């Protein structure tokens, strides 16, 4: 040995790397193609990129933009200005972001004038401007959708807008009643992780998370956790019923859509569940508590 290198493990590690890499070419192309047309054929669209459930998906999306901006410095695409906006900076607060995106401004922020500029100031008075709004979800509905319909359909605006968000975004409804938008609107759906495989990963990731822990009792009989022993420190078993993981795996899988998002949750459910055992003080509602049982409320708290 040597022997730290074998086929079976190398192949499997390699097949994964490959399946992953294929998935990112499929995702990159999905985003690139339609947006690239849009640009080439000087036209206005609203793209909604959905299923961007982890940071690696958002990284894909920023790479697709990097290429587009490159394809522009190469005359390969008509000149365009790009602006990225993280929607987690505050709602009225974004209008001045869209303004700034349109032109380098600064007074208040009249939706009325800002809208008049877009749709009325002449088209030869400005070039193509592409805005990417990251995580609109919340801050962005209803009126805004209408404004978008007017700005985008206008022949003076020269504006395409891209939104990127999770799956829990469903304006495919509100779009349908808006023909002048529906006509300029395309949904790009990224690769979904697959329910079964996903929940199986959470279950397995749960087992691994749930390992004994340690609490230290004081002269006050109070209980506290221990930095990973002394005589006044006891081991606690961390368990969860089988039939209940099944459920929690399913629901969390649903709420997550991404292995990355699920695992962050399990990790914190587990930290909460622990934090609770020490609350319970080893004695609760009559019977005494010697081990900790995982319950779904610990996950809801983890989520929010």
Curated annotation (Swiss-Prot):
Name under which the protein is recorded: Regulatory protein SIR3
PTM per Swiss-Prot/TrEMBL: N-terminal acetylation by NatA is important for transcriptional silencing activity.
Biological role: The proteins SIR1 through SIR4 are required for transcriptional repression of the silent mating type loci, HML and HMR. The proteins SIR2 through SIR4 repress mulitple loci by modulating chromatin structure. Involves the compaction of chromatin fiber into a more condensed form.
Compartments, record wording: Nucleus
Coiled-coil intervals, chain numbering: none
Superkingdom in the source lineage: Eukaryota
Subunit structure: Homodimer and interacts with SIR4 and RAP1 C-terminus. Interacts with MCM10.
Gene from which this protein is expressed: SIR3
Further comment: Present with 1400 molecules/cell in log phase SD medium.
